[PDB]
């Protein structure tokens, strides 16, 4: 069972590396964040 | 804009109608559930 | 669930990053904006 | 002036004709509803 | 509140982005213009 | 070389013949109505 | 050369035979009328 | 409804844009010209 | 040879003799029914 | 109505555009030529 | 946001529904099991 | 095979294996390799 | 409404209703009408 | 075929056969099946 | 409540009327035969 | 060539794989069963 | 529930009726032949 | 010299890779098997 | 086994019927040719 | 020009890189092998 | 095994058939020419 | 190696065919010009 | 006007930040070096 | 004045960066090599 997921509302650029997307997701009260594989979107995750 | 989303862990088959996927997601402590477009998965949603 | 969606009327080009589409949607009396997955269109959103 | 659009949360089955989807959308405080052409979803619309 | 629709009689090329189709429709006494997704036609709209 | 068209909101079933679709469109303040070719929808038309 | 063509505005039924479709076209200020191949529509023709 | 139409006799190739087919129709004593949807033919329209 | 649909034929073309006479009145040499649409198709040189 | 139609005999290729079939069909002593939509046959026509 | 993952060694066929793969993974000392999206493989998951 | 999971601690792009392998051992894994296309640091440990 | 079934005894194309109605009554039905498009003799009787 | 009629008690859209078959049995029919395109619950019984 | 269906192997033409197709199906030890709606095929039926 | 086929009367769900529909058809005194192409129906077959 | 199928090598035109396709298939050492539903191809069949 | 073709009677799942379908077709006394592009069916082949 | 395939090099037009493409492929020392379904290409086949 | 082409009969899974597909095709008496662009199949090539 | 390829600099229109594009590439000192699949471009090829 | 690329400053409309775009780039002191695949822009190239 | 653009020929790895790409482009006789949005390519820019 | 393109025959891995693809292309008697945009293939270029 993976965590929930919602695209970041504060991430401005194109998700290349994981640490930058995690930093923006933590502002949105998420526990982690990673880049989408194809569209390169910053996806925030949290235990649901 | 959306809310937190995750695939259903308890949905048995193909998601075609919404009520069967909604009832499975509410049992998983979610608020709603809808069918994915192509693979017809039962995606559970809840406010983040 | 999701918010109410509509395509932007003032967005100039191709939706590649979020900030250019969010600002164009906010000027259209919306609350947020994001890019369409394939056609890369600026989609304006706001709570129904 | 296109309306804002969102998929119905209450329409159970597959959208084939307009009246059943329009009934579920108007019940959700929307002004109209129509079927998607390929996937046959019930899309609710209301002015915005 | 869905608007009517008629293909533009003045659009000289292929509907690739929205602004040039919106401007060509306003000159035809229409209120909005959008591109058809497949054939890339400029479709004008107005309240009806 | 066409009129402004929009799908009917009151037509109950499948558009097979023209009169039943034309009557529902004139009631909707349109001038004429015809069946769509493939999906068999009642399309209301009126001069732009 | 080939005659100009337009679908009949006043044909009530399904274009099964040519005599009934031809009579309706002449009442619409046309010279002849024939049934379409697939969708069984009453097409009206006149010199051009 | 619609205007009486007939395929152009002088348009040289494939109908891609509207003005090139429109000009070939006005030279054939017509008022407008548009491209057919799938076969991409130059169709000449004029008021009946 | 050349082919054209009949304008004088009143109904569905089931047999050939009814369509053959209707085409001869149209100054054609023969008339036969289409395979599927059951139309009276006149033929002439 | 319609004009008398017959498949062209000189033109042996596949009817892609209208001008090539309209020209070669006339050289068979007809008045017009066009392409069939599906089979792309050069169909001759005359009154 | 994801657990430790490996393809099942005891799942015979192609993963279509979740219950068949989940039962095979638990017998392999795993906590869950889900189908891959494209290749439809039975992937077993357990907390790292 | 082993149990696989993407590294939570690798900072950049997985260019070579040793840097990702060390970062996975600090996450209590036994090995790590680069993803073939996206160049991610995937940690591996025996299940 | 009534229960519907295509006539098994009607010989040809359903052009007018009375010929199809007579054939349906012989099949222990109450009425029969021609279909819109295919012109079939469809029998009707109360379920 | 058997005498068919659309169900007057089936509320939604016919997708699977069991839910429509039960509605037709309550309507004094023997079986029920979905229409192929419109997905309507058709009730069948021996004429 | 249908019977066992199989397409005729002896019908030589297009299934226009039913008596010609029913006769050819009886020679194939089938009890009945009817025309298919769209493709106009001779379909032979018999109790399963 | 083909066998006599009739849609299954006891198949509860939707035909994705052959074994589930084959067992339902053998249960109905048929010899084999397969999934239809589009509507995913379970079709029972047996030698005529 | 079907026989082995391969398209005819010698069928000259469009498969409209069955006997012309069956004749060309039997000469090609097949037992039967029928038309393809849409593309109107002559398909030869023989027991595998 | 194209081989004859028939759908597999024994292949359970959905044809994604060739080895699973080739193995099932070989057990059915066919020489080869492959996946269909769109519907992902297992099709067996052997010399006619 | 399946035959080796290569597109025809001498076929002049658009592949509609099989005999024109088969004759062209045999003129190139292939054994058979067929028309591709969508783009209508003349494809030659020959045992590898 | 282009070589004769046939899908590999022995390639295990998804064609990501070329050398794994080349080695399998050379073993099958072909000269080279490359991956199909979308479906990622191993295609064996050799002079016709 | 594909030849060295470059788009034609002199081909005027949309590549439909091979001879017109092949003739233009021979003028440009190439050995062969074919039409691209989707965009219908004239691509000149020659041995590397 | 690769040349530099800049959009044409003088190309008026939409890049459908290559010859018009290549000629417009030579007037801008470039060596070649070609259309973009999707946006149909006239991209000029010359040795950088 | 717009500056010419070309991918770097000496930048050895994947770009993430701008300064490393600018230094590589200036060595290649360019005036600036920015990195592509998605593919992370070091693109060199200089006035045409 | 563009060059001729051909995919590398000897590039073993995924085309991530350009210098590795250039080396593989120069060994194949090409002048330069770059990575493809979507499929990340090593394309070799040389003057025609
Ligand atoms: C040439 C253009 C062609 C269009 C290319 C289509 C462009 C395209 O592929 O991106 C679209 C997007 C995928 O985008 P992307 O890969 O970046 O995002 C992934 C995707 O959302 C998965 O569904 C997620 O897994 P899950 O759901 O949480 O389990 C995954 O989350 P995670 O696992 O990483 O945490 C995400 O990374 O998905 C679609 O909408 C289907 C499009 C339908 C395309 C239908 C094609 C048959
Ligand atoms: C590249 C093509 C493939 C892309 C696949 C990408 C799959 C995917 O993500 O859904 C998109 C589409 C849904 O089609 P569908 O007609 O049901 O839904 C329409 C679609 O969402 C349009 O984008 C909407 O317009 P817009 O957004 O407001 O502008 C339109 O709203 P409106 O007109 O009523 O206002 C909707 O009706 O699906 C496919 O194209 C093929 C399905 C594949 C499986 C087919 C199974 C039958
Ligand atoms: C091959 C591409 C397929 C993608 C779909 C193609 C993309 C798409 O949007 O489809 C619309 C199509 C239209 O069908 P339909 O004939 O009913 O509607 C016609 C269509 O809107 C034309 O564009 C209209 O002309 P125009 O615009 O005013 O000039 C015409 O009006 P008029 O001329 O009579 O006045 C209308 O009659 O319906 C499907 O095929 C859905 C089948 C889905 C099957 C549902 C189950 C899966
Ligand atoms: C791939 C594109 C083709 C399909 C989509 C095409 C959809 C579309 O564009 O509508 C046109 C067609 C109307 O068919 P229909 O036979 O009623 O009308 C004919 C048609 O309009 C021809 O184009 C006319 O010739 P032309 O143009 O004036 O020279 C001809 O005039 P005439 O010369 O006889 O007097 C008319 O008779 O409708 C379908 O094909 C639906 C079949 C699908 C039904 C569903 C089947 C599953
Ligand atoms: C195989 C099944 C075919 C049966 C279906 C064939 C049915 C058929 O023959 O119609 C032509 C249609 C394409 O015609 P196309 O879309 O270009 O032209 C439209 C068509 O004529 C409509 O009927 C018109 O509406 P209406 O009627 O006046 O109201 C419409 O007028 P308008 O709206 O623009 O003003 C026209 O735009 O189909 C094909 O030929 C595709 C060939 C596929 C390629 C295969 C051949 C290589
Ligand atoms: C059916 C048709 C078959 C042909 C379609 C062939 C297209 C194709 O299938 O590719 C996808 C394939 C497997 O995809 P598939 O969706 O089955 O498996 C997913 C994939 O392994 C992800 O990487 C996993 O996420 P993550 O990494 O752990 O975060 C995910 O785990 P989880 O989300 O469940 O936790 C898995 O479900 O993997 C490739 O990249 C091959 C190179 C692609 C081609 C590269 C082109 C350059
Ligand atoms: C192939 C493309 C062209 C189609 C031409 C092919 C010819 C064609 O159009 O077939 C029509 C055929 C029968 O139509 P037909 O008019 O003969 O008979 C009517 C039909 O059975 C309706 O379903 C009934 O409605 P309902 O019982 O009251 O609910 C009606 O009952 P009633 O009211 O009289 O008592 C009957 O009269 O219906 C199909 O199978 C759907 C085909 C899909 C149509 C394709 C849509 C594009
Ligand atoms: C979802 C997209 C929207 C729908 C788009 C497609 C719209 C469309 O195709 O309509 C089909 C619909 C009936 O289709 P549908 O499959 O739902 O209903 C079947 C139909 O009534 C047959 O006639 C019945 O057989 P029969 O008669 O007893 O022998 C059959 O009974 P059974 O075998 O199950 O027991 C029924 O299941 O009604 C029309 O025919 C209108 C003519 C349409 C063409 C009009 C041309 C003028
Ligand atoms: C995805 C779009 C759908 C098209 C897919 C095509 C779907 C397909 O493969 O069937 C062919 C279809 C049916 O033809 P047709 O009406 O002659 O045959 C009927 C059909 O087999 C039904 O399934 C039968 O009911 P059931 O099964 O026993 O319950 C019915 O038996 P019954 O009830 O009378 O006893 C039969 O009458 O005709 C076309 O070609 C559509 C034009 C397609 C050409 C498209 C371009 C013009
Ligand atoms: C538009 C026309 C649709 C008519 C489809 C009518 C129903 C139908 O026939 O489906 C088959 C087709 C392709 O499906 P698919 O690729 O899985 O199967 C192939 C197809 O049957 C070809 O016809 C075969 O070649 P041939 O015949 O031996 O020459 C080929 O065999 P081979 O070459 O490998 O040996 C098969 O692999 O699917 C669709 O077009 C629409 C599905 C999209 C989803 C539908 C949802 C609505
Ligand atoms: C969207 C459907 C529209 C109809 C498309 C009908 C389906 C269809 O056309 O398949 C082919 C396509 C591409 O296949 P793919 O790219 O893997 O393989 C290429 C393809 O075979 C080309 O035809 C080859 O060129 P050519 O012939 O030698 O000149 C080329 O050879 P080369 O260049 O490498 O040397 C091959 O690489 O695969 C799909 O999209 C399946 C989507 C369905 C997936 C269903 C998943 C559920
Ligand atoms: C669905 C997306 C639509 C397909 C997109 C298909 C588009 C395509 O084929 O290549 C473009 C893109 C490269 O993106 P990338 O950002 O690296 O390169 C940009 C591109 O060159 C633009 O043209 C430049 O803008 P402009 O012209 O000078 O104004 C821009 O330079 P600048 O502005 O910074 O100076 C460059 O950054 O590649 C992919 O999409 C990766 C495929 C992964 C996803 C595959 C898609 C399924
Ligand atoms: C229309 C949908 C896509 C059809 C693809 C049909 C075409 C096809 O199969 O390959 C194209 C593309 C690979 O593109 P890729 O980026 O790898 O390679 C580029 C491509 O070959 C261009 O055509 C080249 O330009 P040109 O031609 O020389 O001018 C360009 O040369 P250069 O500029 O670098 O020097 C190359 O870099 O593959 C997909 O889009 C699959 C994405 C997912 C699609 C799968 C959807 C299910």
Curated annotation (Swiss-Prot), chains A, B, C, D, E, F, G, H, K, O, P, Q, R, S, T, U, V, W, X:
A 1,2-diacyl-sn-glycero-3-phosphate 1 binds at residues 37, 40. SUPFAM superfamilies: Scorpion toxin-like (SSF57095). The record marks 16, 38 as: Required for formation of double helix. GO terms for molecular function: phosphatidic acid binding. The keyword Transmembrane does not apply. This is Defensin NsD7. It holds the Pfam family Gamma-thionin. Belongs to the DEFL family. Plant defense peptide. Disrupts membranes containing phosphatidic acid (PA) via a PA-dependent oligomerization process. GO terms for biological process: defense response; killing of cells of another organism. It is found in: Vacuole. In the presence of phosphatidic acid (PA), forms right-handed double helices which tend to bundle into fibrils. Each helix is a repetition of dimers containing 2 bound molecules of PA per dimer. Dimers are arranged orthogonally in a tip-to-tip configuration with 1 molecule of PA located at the dimer contact interface. Association of 2 helices to form a double helix depends on intercalating isoleucine residues Ile-16 and Ile-38. Bundling of double helices into fibrils depends on Arg-27. It comes from the Eukaryota. Changing residue 5 to E: Unperturbed ability for fibril formation and membrane disrupting activity. The keyword Disulfide bond applies. InterPro entries: Defensin_plant, Scorpion_toxin-like, Scorpion_toxin-like_sf. Disulfide bonds join 4-48, 15-35, 21-42, 25-44. A 1,2-diacyl-sn-glycero-3-phosphate 2 binds at residues 5, 34. It comes from Nicotiana suaveolens. GO terms for cellular component: vacuole. Keywords: Cytolysis, Disulfide bond, Lipid-binding, Plant defense, Vacuole. PROSITE patterns: GAMMA_THIONIN.
UniProtKB/Swiss-Prot annotation, chain I:
Signal peptide: none annotated. Gene3D superfamilies: Knottin, scorpion toxin-like. Changing residue 3 to E: Unperturbed ability for fibril formation and membrane disrupting activity. A 1,2-diacyl-sn-glycero-3-phosphate 2 binds at residues 3, 32. GO terms for biological process: defense response; killing of cells of another organism. In the presence of phosphatidic acid (PA), forms right-handed double helices which tend to bundle into fibrils. Each helix is a repetition of dimers containing 2 bound molecules of PA per dimer. Dimers are arranged orthogonally in a tip-to-tip configuration with 1 molecule of PA located at the dimer contact interface. Association of 2 helices to form a double helix depends on intercalating isoleucine residues Ile-14 and Ile-36. Bundling of double helices into fibrils depends on Arg-25. Plant defense peptide. Disrupts membranes containing phosphatidic acid (PA) via a PA-dependent oligomerization process. This is Defensin NsD7. It comes from Nicotiana suaveolens (Australian tobacco). The lineage of its organism: Eukaryota, Viridiplantae, Streptophyta, Embryophyta, Tracheophyta.
């Amino acid at each position: 069972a993976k965590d929930c997921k919602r695209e970041s509302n504060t991430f401005p650029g194109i998700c290349i590396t994981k640490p930058p997307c995690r930093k923006a997701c933590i502002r949105e009260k998420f526990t982690d964040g990673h880049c989408s594989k194809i569209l390169r979107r910053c996806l925030c995750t949290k235990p649901c």
